[PDB]
PDB file of C-alpha atoms and ligand atoms in Angstrom:
ATOM      1  CA  UNK Q   1      42.213  41.184  49.126  1.00  0.00           C
ATOM      2  CA  UNK Q   2      40.207  41.825  45.813  1.00  0.00           C
ATOM      3  CA  UNK Q   3      36.910  42.058  47.877  1.00  0.00           C
ATOM      4  CA  UNK Q   4      35.429  45.335  47.747  1.00  0.00           C
ATOM      5  CA  UNK Q   5      37.542  46.270  44.787  1.00  0.00           C
ATOM      6  CA  UNK Q   6      35.025  47.455  41.875  1.00  0.00           C
ATOM      7  CA  UNK Q   7      37.083  47.979  38.743  1.00  0.00           C
ATOM      8  CA  UNK Q   8      34.189  49.189  36.947  1.00  0.00           C
ATOM      9  CA  UNK Q   9      33.361  51.709  39.572  1.00  0.00           C
ATOM     10  CA  UNK Q  10      36.820  53.221  39.117  1.00  0.00           C
ATOM     11  CA  UNK Q  11      36.181  53.381  35.348  1.00  0.00           C
ATOM     12  CA  UNK Q  12      33.182  55.341  36.081  1.00  0.00           C
ATOM     13  CA  UNK Q  13      34.941  57.519  38.375  1.00  0.00           C
ATOM     14  CA  UNK Q  14      37.632  58.483  35.573  1.00  0.00           C
ATOM     15  CA  UNK Q  15      34.680  59.097  33.002  1.00  0.00           C
ATOM     16  CA  UNK Q  16      32.912  61.420  35.306  1.00  0.00           C
ATOM     17  CA  UNK Q  17      36.309  63.459  36.055  1.00  0.00           C
ATOM     18  CA  UNK Q  18      36.569  63.716  32.136  1.00  0.00           C
ATOM     19  CA  UNK Q  19      33.084  65.188  32.226  1.00  0.00           C
ATOM     20  CA  UNK Q  20      34.673  68.079  34.527  1.00  0.00           C
ATOM     21  CA  UNK Q  21      32.701  66.762  37.417  1.00  0.00           C
ATOM     22  CA  UNK Q  22      34.168  67.750  41.028  1.00  0.00           C
ATOM     23  CA  UNK Q  23      35.638  65.284  43.410  1.00  0.00           C
ATOM     24  CA  UNK Q  24      32.729  66.190  45.964  1.00  0.00           C
ATOM     25  CA  UNK Q  25      30.146  65.049  43.266  1.00  0.00           C
ATOM     26  CA  UNK Q  26      32.007  61.997  42.107  1.00  0.00           C
ATOM     27  CA  UNK Q  27      33.216  60.615  45.384  1.00  0.00           C
ATOM     28  CA  UNK Q  28      29.803  61.104  46.875  1.00  0.00           C
ATOM     29  CA  UNK Q  29      28.293  58.912  43.938  1.00  0.00           C
ATOM     30  CA  UNK Q  30      31.028  56.251  44.042  1.00  0.00           C
ATOM     31  CA  UNK Q  31      30.668  55.970  48.018  1.00  0.00           C
ATOM     32  CA  UNK Q  32      26.910  55.332  47.312  1.00  0.00           C
ATOM     33  CA  UNK Q  33      27.486  52.795  44.875  1.00  0.00           C
ATOM     34  CA  UNK Q  34      30.048  51.112  46.959  1.00  0.00           C
ATOM     35  CA  UNK Q  35      27.821  51.144  50.111  1.00  0.00           C
ATOM     36  CA  UNK Q  36      25.136  49.694  48.146  1.00  0.00           C
ATOM     37  CA  UNK Q  37      27.421  46.897  46.730  1.00  0.00           C
ATOM     38  CA  UNK Q  38      28.882  45.762  49.936  1.00  0.00           C
ATOM     39  CA  UNK Q  39      25.550  46.045  51.945  1.00  0.00           C
ATOM     40  CA  UNK Q  40      23.699  43.806  49.167  1.00  0.00           C
ATOM     41  CA  UNK Q  41      27.066  41.498  48.920  1.00  0.00           C
ATOM     42  CA  UNK Q  42      27.068  41.923  45.124  1.00  0.00           C
ATOM     43  CA  UNK Q  43      29.342  43.614  42.585  1.00  0.00           C
ATOM     44  CA  UNK Q  44      27.704  47.116  41.893  1.00  0.00           C
ATOM     45  CA  UNK Q  45      27.723  46.253  38.154  1.00  0.00           C
ATOM     46  CA  UNK Q  46      25.600  43.177  38.343  1.00  0.00           C
ATOM     47  CA  UNK Q  47      23.120  44.486  41.282  1.00  0.00           C
ATOM     48  CA  UNK Q  48      19.462  43.211  40.397  1.00  0.00           C
ATOM     49  CA  UNK Q  49      16.161  45.157  40.804  1.00  0.00           C
ATOM     50  CA  UNK Q  50      15.348  43.128  44.103  1.00  0.00           C
ATOM     51  CA  UNK Q  51      18.626  43.724  45.657  1.00  0.00           C
ATOM     52  CA  UNK Q  52      18.451  47.600  44.895  1.00  0.00           C
ATOM     53  CA  UNK Q  53      14.894  47.991  46.159  1.00  0.00           C
ATOM     54  CA  UNK Q  54      15.926  45.944  49.500  1.00  0.00           C
ATOM     55  CA  UNK Q  55      19.095  48.319  49.925  1.00  0.00           C
ATOM     56  CA  UNK Q  56      16.744  51.523  49.666  1.00  0.00           C
ATOM     57  CA  UNK Q  57      14.251  50.468  51.991  1.00  0.00           C
ATOM     58  CA  UNK Q  58      16.364  48.362  54.426  1.00  0.00           C
ATOM     59  CA  UNK Q  59      20.293  49.314  54.048  1.00  0.00           C
ATOM     60  CA  UNK Q  60      19.646  52.265  56.348  1.00  0.00           C
ATOM     61  CA  UNK Q  61      17.131  54.535  58.083  1.00  0.00           C
ATOM     62  CA  UNK Q  62      17.423  57.126  55.451  1.00  0.00           C
ATOM     63  CA  UNK Q  63      16.078  60.592  55.490  1.00  0.00           C
ATOM     64  CA  UNK Q  64      13.963  61.498  52.624  1.00  0.00           C
ATOM     65  CA  UNK Q  65      16.835  63.677  51.251  1.00  0.00           C
ATOM     66  CA  UNK Q  66      19.218  60.856  51.689  1.00  0.00           C
ATOM     67  CA  UNK Q  67      17.064  58.379  49.894  1.00  0.00           C
ATOM     68  CA  UNK Q  68      16.410  60.760  47.101  1.00  0.00           C
ATOM     69  CA  UNK Q  69      20.074  61.660  46.568  1.00  0.00           C
ATOM     70  CA  UNK Q  70      21.032  57.815  46.690  1.00  0.00           C
ATOM     71  CA  UNK Q  71      18.321  56.968  44.200  1.00  0.00           C
ATOM     72  CA  UNK Q  72      19.860  59.769  41.878  1.00  0.00           C
ATOM     73  CA  UNK Q  73      23.498  58.285  42.253  1.00  0.00           C
ATOM     74  CA  UNK Q  74      22.535  54.722  41.644  1.00  0.00           C
ATOM     75  CA  UNK Q  75      20.550  56.180  38.539  1.00  0.00           C
ATOM     76  CA  UNK Q  76      23.452  57.733  37.337  1.00  0.00           C
ATOM     77  CA  UNK Q  77      25.450  54.562  37.595  1.00  0.00           C
ATOM     78  CA  UNK Q  78      23.105  52.170  35.957  1.00  0.00           C
ATOM     79  CA  UNK Q  79      22.361  54.506  33.157  1.00  0.00           C
ATOM     80  CA  UNK Q  80      26.249  54.819  32.438  1.00  0.00           C
ATOM     81  CA  UNK Q  81      26.531  51.106  32.547  1.00  0.00           C
ATOM     82  CA  UNK Q  82      23.852  50.821  29.952  1.00  0.00           C
ATOM     83  CA  UNK Q  83      24.813  53.709  27.988  1.00  0.00           C
ATOM     84  CA  UNK Q  84      28.548  52.714  27.690  1.00  0.00           C
ATOM     85  CA  UNK Q  85      27.292  49.351  26.408  1.00  0.00           C
ATOM     86  CA  UNK Q  86      28.557  47.247  29.786  1.00  0.00           C
ATOM     87  CA  UNK Q  87      25.055  46.373  30.735  1.00  0.00           C
ATOM     88  CA  UNK Q  88      21.796  45.587  28.456  1.00  0.00           C
ATOM     89  CA  UNK Q  89      19.548  46.488  31.075  1.00  0.00           C
ATOM     90  CA  UNK Q  90      19.149  49.329  33.742  1.00  0.00           C
ATOM     91  CA  UNK Q  91      17.327  48.081  36.740  1.00  0.00           C
ATOM     92  CA  UNK Q  92      16.271  51.546  38.065  1.00  0.00           C
ATOM     93  CA  UNK Q  93      13.737  51.676  35.362  1.00  0.00           C
ATOM     94  CA  UNK Q  94      11.853  49.154  37.581  1.00  0.00           C
ATOM     95  CA  UNK Q  95      12.233  51.203  40.576  1.00  0.00           C
ATOM     96  CA  UNK Q  96       9.894  54.099  41.362  1.00  0.00           C
ATOM     97  CA  UNK Q  97      11.560  57.183  42.387  1.00  0.00           C
ATOM     98  CA  UNK Q  98      11.191  57.896  46.258  1.00  0.00           C
ATOM     99  CA  UNK Q  99       9.383  60.637  47.780  1.00  0.00           C
ATOM    100  CA  UNK Q 100      10.754  63.994  46.536  1.00  0.00           C
ATOM    101  CA  UNK Q 101      12.254  65.941  49.640  1.00  0.00           C
ATOM    102  CA  UNK Q 102      11.266  69.387  50.786  1.00  0.00           C
ATOM    103  CA  UNK Q 103      13.196  71.859  48.626  1.00  0.00           C
ATOM    104  CA  UNK Q 104      14.519  74.055  51.324  1.00  0.00           C
ATOM    105  CA  UNK Q 105      14.209  77.817  49.715  1.00  0.00           C
ATOM    106  CA  UNK Q 106      16.689  80.732  50.262  1.00  0.00           C
ATOM    107  CA  UNK Q 107      15.871  82.420  53.438  1.00  0.00           C
ATOM    108  CA  UNK Q 108      15.481  86.095  53.278  1.00  0.00           C
ATOM    109  CA  UNK Q 109      18.425  88.006  55.138  1.00  0.00           C
ATOM    110  CA  UNK Q 110      18.949  91.021  57.121  1.00  0.00           C
ATOM    111  CA  UNK Q 111      20.573  92.764  54.063  1.00  0.00           C
ATOM    112  CA  UNK Q 112      17.538  91.669  51.916  1.00  0.00           C
ATOM    113  CA  UNK Q 113      15.243  93.463  54.306  1.00  0.00           C
ATOM    114  CA  UNK Q 114      17.369  96.283  54.376  1.00  0.00           C
ATOM    115  CA  UNK Q 115      17.236  96.823  50.772  1.00  0.00           C
ATOM    116  CA  UNK Q 116      13.497  96.096  50.625  1.00  0.00           C
ATOM    117  CA  UNK Q 117      12.920  98.805  53.206  1.00  0.00           C
ATOM    118  CA  UNK Q 118      15.101 101.078  50.990  1.00  0.00           C
ATOM    119  CA  UNK Q 119      13.336 100.693  47.671  1.00  0.00           C
ATOM    120  CA  UNK Q 120      11.500 103.771  46.701  1.00  0.00           C
ATOM    121  CA  UNK Q 121       7.779 102.912  46.793  1.00  0.00           C
ATOM    122  CA  UNK Q 122       4.439 104.039  47.390  1.00  0.00           C
ATOM    123  CA  UNK Q 123       3.463 104.143  51.247  1.00  0.00           C
ATOM    124  CA  UNK Q 124       0.875 101.197  50.782  1.00  0.00           C
ATOM    125  CA  UNK Q 125       3.544  99.303  49.331  1.00  0.00           C
ATOM    126  CA  UNK Q 126       5.841 100.021  52.401  1.00  0.00           C
ATOM    127  CA  UNK Q 127       2.989  99.381  54.625  1.00  0.00           C
ATOM    128  CA  UNK Q 128       2.539  95.817  53.022  1.00  0.00           C
ATOM    129  CA  UNK Q 129       6.047  95.250  53.414  1.00  0.00           C
ATOM    130  CA  UNK Q 130       6.035  96.169  57.032  1.00  0.00           C
ATOM    131  CA  UNK Q 131       3.152  94.343  58.252  1.00  0.00           C
ATOM    132  CA  UNK Q 132       4.653  91.055  56.746  1.00  0.00           C
ATOM    133  CA  UNK Q 133       8.331  91.298  58.020  1.00  0.00           C
ATOM    134  CA  UNK Q 134       7.721  93.242  61.300  1.00  0.00           C
ATOM    135  CA  UNK Q 135       4.352  91.776  62.557  1.00  0.00           C
ATOM    136  CA  UNK Q 136       4.463  88.389  60.745  1.00  0.00           C
ATOM    137  CA  UNK Q 137       1.241  88.833  58.912  1.00  0.00           C
ATOM    138  CA  UNK Q 138       0.083  86.519  56.043  1.00  0.00           C
ATOM    139  CA  UNK Q 139      -1.153  88.114  52.832  1.00  0.00           C
ATOM    140  CA  UNK Q 140      -4.930  87.712  53.527  1.00  0.00           C
ATOM    141  CA  UNK Q 141      -4.468  89.255  56.963  1.00  0.00           C
ATOM    142  CA  UNK Q 142      -2.542  92.214  55.515  1.00  0.00           C
ATOM    143  CA  UNK Q 143      -4.924  92.756  52.848  1.00  0.00           C
ATOM    144  CA  UNK Q 144      -7.876  93.098  55.242  1.00  0.00           C
ATOM    145  CA  UNK Q 145      -6.191  95.540  57.921  1.00  0.00           C
ATOM    146  CA  UNK Q 146      -8.036  98.515  59.046  1.00  0.00           C
ATOM    147  CA  UNK Q 147      -6.930 101.620  61.189  1.00  0.00           C
ATOM    148  CA  UNK Q 148      -9.554 100.507  63.624  1.00  0.00           C
ATOM    149  CA  UNK Q 149      -7.589  97.460  64.258  1.00  0.00           C
ATOM    150  CA  UNK Q 150      -4.845  98.910  65.630  1.00  0.00           C
ATOM    151  CA  UNK Q 151      -4.427 100.896  69.192  1.00  0.00           C
ATOM    152  CA  UNK Q 152      -1.468 103.195  68.626  1.00  0.00           C
ATOM    153  CA  UNK Q 153      -1.706 104.562  72.160  1.00  0.00           C
ATOM    154  CA  UNK Q 154      -1.258 101.097  73.635  1.00  0.00           C
ATOM    155  CA  UNK Q 155       0.581  99.958  70.553  1.00  0.00           C
ATOM    156  CA  UNK Q 156      -1.514  96.684  69.881  1.00  0.00           C
ATOM    157  CA  UNK Q 157      -3.493  95.708  67.114  1.00  0.00           C
ATOM    158  CA  UNK Q 158      -5.992  92.764  66.763  1.00  0.00           C
ATOM    159  CA  UNK Q 159      -5.781  89.890  64.117  1.00  0.00           C
ATOM    160  CA  UNK Q 160      -7.112  86.428  63.811  1.00  0.00           C
ATOM    161  CA  UNK Q 161      -5.147  84.051  65.711  1.00  0.00           C
ATOM    162  CA  UNK Q 162      -6.263  80.259  65.445  1.00  0.00           C
ATOM    163  CA  UNK Q 163      -9.585  79.745  63.930  1.00  0.00           C
ATOM    164  CA  UNK Q 164     -12.168  82.467  64.752  1.00  0.00           C
ATOM    165  CA  UNK Q 165     -10.142  83.427  67.889  1.00  0.00           C
ATOM    166  CA  UNK Q 166      -8.799  86.897  68.015  1.00  0.00           C
ATOM    167  CA  UNK Q 167      -5.437  87.598  68.977  1.00  0.00           C
ATOM    168  CA  UNK Q 168      -3.801  90.771  70.323  1.00  0.00           C
ATOM    169  CA  UNK Q 169      -0.326  91.507  69.081  1.00  0.00           C
ATOM    170  CA  UNK Q 170       2.048  94.247  70.086  1.00  0.00           C
ATOM    171  CA  UNK Q 171       3.137  96.773  67.476  1.00  0.00           C
ATOM    172  CA  UNK Q 172       6.706  97.229  66.220  1.00  0.00           C
ATOM    173  CA  UNK Q 173       7.574 100.706  66.261  1.00  0.00           C
ATOM    174  CA  UNK Q 174       8.331 100.684  62.380  1.00  0.00           C
ATOM    175  CA  UNK Q 175       4.442  99.634  62.009  1.00  0.00           C
ATOM    176  CA  UNK Q 176       3.190 102.263  64.589  1.00  0.00           C
ATOM    177  CA  UNK Q 177       5.219 104.970  62.610  1.00  0.00           C
ATOM    178  CA  UNK Q 178       3.476 103.814  59.241  1.00  0.00           C
ATOM    179  CA  UNK Q 179       0.107 103.515  60.823  1.00  0.00           C
ATOM    180  CA  UNK Q 180       0.147 107.322  61.704  1.00  0.00           C
ATOM    181  CA  UNK Q 181       0.477 107.740  57.844  1.00  0.00           C
ATOM    182  CA  UNK Q 182      -2.584 105.425  56.999  1.00  0.00           C
ATOM    183  CA  UNK Q 183      -6.133 105.516  57.710  1.00  0.00           C
ATOM    184  CA  UNK Q 184      -6.811 105.544  61.391  1.00  0.00           C
ATOM    185  CA  UNK Q 185     -10.323 103.972  60.676  1.00  0.00           C
ATOM    186  CA  UNK Q 186     -10.812 102.532  57.246  1.00  0.00           C
ATOM    187  CA  UNK Q 187      -8.981 100.051  55.163  1.00  0.00           C
ATOM    188  CA  UNK Q 188      -5.414 100.704  54.582  1.00  0.00           C
ATOM    189  CA  UNK Q 189      -5.560  98.828  51.249  1.00  0.00           C
ATOM    190  CA  UNK Q 190      -9.003  99.897  49.701  1.00  0.00           C
ATOM    191  CA  UNK Q 191     -10.122  97.815  46.774  1.00  0.00           C
ATOM    192  CA  UNK Q 192     -13.178  95.955  45.520  1.00  0.00           C
ATOM    193  CA  UNK Q 193     -13.143  93.128  47.647  1.00  0.00           C
ATOM    194  CA  UNK Q 194     -15.192  93.342  50.761  1.00  0.00           C
ATOM    195  CA  UNK Q 195     -13.742  97.054  50.670  1.00  0.00           C
ATOM    196  CA  UNK Q 196     -10.004  96.161  50.358  1.00  0.00           C
ATOM    197  CA  UNK Q 197      -7.501  94.916  47.906  1.00  0.00           C
ATOM    198  CA  UNK Q 198      -7.427  91.198  46.652  1.00  0.00           C
ATOM    199  CA  UNK Q 199      -4.926  89.177  48.617  1.00  0.00           C
ATOM    200  CA  UNK Q 200      -3.423  88.145  45.222  1.00  0.00           C
ATOM    201  CA  UNK Q 201      -2.589  91.637  44.569  1.00  0.00           C
ATOM    202  CA  UNK Q 202      -0.664  92.130  48.116  1.00  0.00           C
ATOM    203  CA  UNK Q 203       1.081  89.049  47.205  1.00  0.00           C
ATOM    204  CA  UNK Q 204       1.939  90.488  43.709  1.00  0.00           C
ATOM    205  CA  UNK Q 205       3.189  93.819  45.354  1.00  0.00           C
ATOM    206  CA  UNK Q 206       5.450  92.028  47.857  1.00  0.00           C
ATOM    207  CA  UNK Q 207       6.749  90.056  45.320  1.00  0.00           C
ATOM    208  CA  UNK Q 208       7.486  92.974  42.736  1.00  0.00           C
ATOM    209  CA  UNK Q 209       8.910  94.925  45.555  1.00  0.00           C
ATOM    210  CA  UNK Q 210      11.222  92.075  46.469  1.00  0.00           C
ATOM    211  CA  UNK Q 211      12.525  91.715  42.912  1.00  0.00           C
ATOM    212  CA  UNK Q 212      13.068  95.313  42.564  1.00  0.00           C
ATOM    213  CA  UNK Q 213      15.304  94.999  45.981  1.00  0.00           C
ATOM    214  CA  UNK Q 214      17.202  92.081  44.448  1.00  0.00           C
ATOM    215  CA  UNK Q 215      15.629  89.665  47.013  1.00  0.00           C
ATOM    216  CA  UNK Q 216      14.406  86.276  45.847  1.00  0.00           C
ATOM    217  CA  UNK Q 217      11.420  85.114  47.924  1.00  0.00           C
ATOM    218  CA  UNK Q 218       7.669  85.849  48.768  1.00  0.00           C
ATOM    219  CA  UNK Q 219       5.447  87.541  51.241  1.00  0.00           C
ATOM    220  CA  UNK Q 220       5.648  84.133  53.417  1.00  0.00           C
ATOM    221  CA  UNK Q 221       9.252  84.506  53.263  1.00  0.00           C
ATOM    222  CA  UNK Q 222       8.980  87.743  55.301  1.00  0.00           C
ATOM    223  CA  UNK Q 223       6.900  86.220  57.707  1.00  0.00           C
ATOM    224  CA  UNK Q 224       9.529  83.491  58.176  1.00  0.00           C
ATOM    225  CA  UNK Q 225      12.303  86.378  58.281  1.00  0.00           C
ATOM    226  CA  UNK Q 226      10.042  87.770  61.255  1.00  0.00           C
ATOM    227  CA  UNK Q 227      10.249  84.436  63.151  1.00  0.00           C
ATOM    228  CA  UNK Q 228      13.785  83.803  62.253  1.00  0.00           C
ATOM    229  CA  UNK Q 229      14.999  87.257  63.055  1.00  0.00           C
ATOM    230  CA  UNK Q 230      13.417  87.179  66.519  1.00  0.00           C
ATOM    231  CA  UNK Q 231      14.998  83.863  67.391  1.00  0.00           C
ATOM    232  CA  UNK Q 232      18.282  85.372  66.440  1.00  0.00           C
ATOM    233  CA  UNK Q 233      17.680  88.527  68.459  1.00  0.00           C
ATOM    234  CA  UNK Q 234      17.521  86.301  71.734  1.00  0.00           C
ATOM    235  CA  UNK Q 235      13.802  85.809  71.790  1.00  0.00           C
ATOM    236  CA  UNK Q 236      12.569  82.577  73.248  1.00  0.00           C
ATOM    237  CA  UNK Q 237      11.050  79.924  70.879  1.00  0.00           C
ATOM    238  CA  UNK Q 238       7.737  79.960  72.816  1.00  0.00           C
ATOM    239  CA  UNK Q 239       7.447  83.827  72.376  1.00  0.00           C
ATOM    240  CA  UNK Q 240       8.091  83.686  68.825  1.00  0.00           C
ATOM    241  CA  UNK Q 241       5.534  81.168  68.091  1.00  0.00           C
ATOM    242  CA  UNK Q 242       3.134  83.546  69.890  1.00  0.00           C
ATOM    243  CA  UNK Q 243       4.033  86.707  68.061  1.00  0.00           C
ATOM    244  CA  UNK Q 244       3.705  84.310  64.761  1.00  0.00           C
ATOM    245  CA  UNK Q 245       0.390  82.940  66.091  1.00  0.00           C
ATOM    246  CA  UNK Q 246       2.218  79.680  64.904  1.00  0.00           C
ATOM    247  CA  UNK Q 247      -0.545  76.842  64.646  1.00  0.00           C
ATOM    248  CA  UNK Q 248       1.680  74.358  66.742  1.00  0.00           C
ATOM    249  CA  UNK Q 249       0.188  76.532  69.663  1.00  0.00           C
ATOM    250  CA  UNK Q 250      -3.680  76.220  70.976  1.00  0.00           C
ATOM    251  CA  UNK Q 251      -5.667  79.227  70.015  1.00  0.00           C
ATOM    252  CA  UNK Q 252      -5.722  79.882  73.845  1.00  0.00           C
ATOM    253  CA  UNK Q 253      -2.011  79.866  74.054  1.00  0.00           C
ATOM    254  CA  UNK Q 254      -2.020  82.361  71.231  1.00  0.00           C
ATOM    255  CA  UNK Q 255      -4.549  84.572  72.326  1.00  0.00           C
ATOM    256  CA  UNK Q 256      -3.666  84.858  76.232  1.00  0.00           C
ATOM    257  CA  UNK Q 257      -1.973  88.182  77.326  1.00  0.00           C
ATOM    258  CA  UNK Q 258      -0.501  86.659  80.237  1.00  0.00           C
ATOM    259  CA  UNK Q 259       2.905  87.150  78.419  1.00  0.00           C
ATOM    260  CA  UNK Q 260       2.079  90.655  76.835  1.00  0.00           C
ATOM    261  CA  UNK Q 261       5.234  92.224  78.171  1.00  0.00           C
ATOM    262  CA  UNK Q 262       7.504  89.371  77.020  1.00  0.00           C
ATOM    263  CA  UNK Q 263       6.058  89.532  73.318  1.00  0.00           C
ATOM    264  CA  UNK Q 264       6.363  93.476  73.256  1.00  0.00           C
ATOM    265  CA  UNK Q 265       9.893  93.412  74.538  1.00  0.00           C
ATOM    266  CA  UNK Q 266      10.536  90.458  72.034  1.00  0.00           C
ATOM    267  CA  UNK Q 267       9.034  92.120  69.128  1.00  0.00           C
ATOM    268  CA  UNK Q 268      10.886  95.305  69.576  1.00  0.00           C
ATOM    269  CA  UNK Q 269      14.265  93.507  69.300  1.00  0.00           C
ATOM    270  CA  UNK Q 270      13.548  93.027  65.616  1.00  0.00           C
ATOM    271  CA  UNK Q 271      16.107  95.001  63.552  1.00  0.00           C
ATOM    272  CA  UNK Q 272      17.510  94.254  60.069  1.00  0.00           C
ATOM    273  CA  UNK Q 273      20.556  96.393  60.833  1.00  0.00           C
ATOM    274  CA  UNK Q 274      21.667  94.371  63.952  1.00  0.00           C
ATOM    275  CA  UNK Q 275      21.239  84.410  68.959  1.00  0.00           C
ATOM    276  CA  UNK Q 276      22.175  81.208  67.134  1.00  0.00           C
ATOM    277  CA  UNK Q 277      19.323  79.778  65.216  1.00  0.00           C
ATOM    278  CA  UNK Q 278      19.792  75.779  64.466  1.00  0.00           C
ATOM    279  CA  UNK Q 279      17.941  73.595  61.797  1.00  0.00           C
ATOM    280  CA  UNK Q 280      15.944  72.209  65.101  1.00  0.00           C
ATOM    281  CA  UNK Q 281      14.535  75.771  66.179  1.00  0.00           C
ATOM    282  CA  UNK Q 282      13.858  76.696  62.552  1.00  0.00           C
ATOM    283  CA  UNK Q 283      11.666  73.628  62.237  1.00  0.00           C
ATOM    284  CA  UNK Q 284       9.856  74.952  65.530  1.00  0.00           C
ATOM    285  CA  UNK Q 285       8.429  77.882  63.556  1.00  0.00           C
ATOM    286  CA  UNK Q 286       8.161  76.261  60.115  1.00  0.00           C
ATOM    287  CA  UNK Q 287       4.678  76.291  58.367  1.00  0.00           C
TER     288      UNK Q 287
HETATM  289 NA1   NA R 301      25.589  58.604  31.564  1.00  0.00          NA
END
């Protein structure tokens, strides 16, 4: 009858609503405190350190995110108990925070890339953006690119794959196009660093262009859009990973050209003006 009735939890619930908190926030916190209490077999306001530690370690096979969230709800509960004068101690002081979960940044969207392609900019800025977003190049790969790395007749380029093993990538038509406006032999981005610009200024350029385009993210996020947008266009996971030179593949699987035609047909589907990507697929191209 009274089992599982936790009058003090309901007091906290009412208090939280009066702080203008939402039902979503409050009911999730209350459910967590009740879950811990029922599993431990204790009234939630009297739970002791070792019970809470046991529940956070053994009450479920929690993900890192779930454990982090649960720790925060328990911290809010016990801090409230102490602050309101209901309990002298706070057992969470004795419990180290769990592993901070990976913060999932905002993925760059097709509309973001549209605006990035539309910002007025020097052609070297446009080239850096195109290499990141439409070839998946990392900023140090962009910085060192030379005209003599590109075959515009065969529409290919050479870049480092895994380790020291060279890879041959098909060129997106947008990159072929800007390549004919760039040096056909020397560095695209001349600078003091082995003849080219520093990777830091390539990163800084892409970052400033994204701010100007109203886009949050970085050059890395454009390489992630490259993979994400390829998957959204129907390209199969393995081909995307080859086009990205993803390190889950071996240098041989990356540098092989048995799949040249699938790769070339895949990369050409990339169109920010345009097939269902899941949390599982996205983890396949993550880095
Ligand atoms: Na409080």
